[PDB]
């Protein structure tokens, strides 16, 4: 389905509204980056601190560190279903798609 129909996708929203929507550790959403042209960010509350990961792509695969997926929803689904860290160094984990 379209990115804009995904449960966790909030489009172009201001930081004030992201900070209000992410309430507990593991809460996350996907949004447009304000400062990186055309880019998406995965924003996750982790240990009291909002964390923002630019969703990268290479060879038509979306990814944060390891090998990626053909779409952003497939990447999110993988992270949410496996509870594997977004990157090795960060240790951040997705738990709740904020609707």
């Amino acid at each position: 389905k379209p990115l804009h129909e995904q449960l966790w996708y909030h489009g172009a929203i201001p930081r004030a509204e992201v900070a209000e929507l992410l309430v507990h550790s593991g809460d996350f959403l996907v949004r447009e980056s304000e400062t990186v042209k055309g880019a998406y960010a995965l924003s996750v509350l982790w240990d009291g601190l909002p964390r923002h990961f630019l969703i990268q792509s290479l060879d038509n695969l979306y990814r944060l560190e390891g090998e990626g997926f053909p779409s952003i929803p497939l990447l999110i689904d993988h992270l949410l279903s496996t509870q594997q860290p977004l990157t090795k160094k960060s240790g951040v984990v997705l738990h709740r798609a904020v609707p």
Partner: peptide
């Protein structure tokens, strides 16, 4: 800093 490494 705002975004994680790329």
């Amino acid at each position: 800093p705002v975004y994680e490494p790329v």
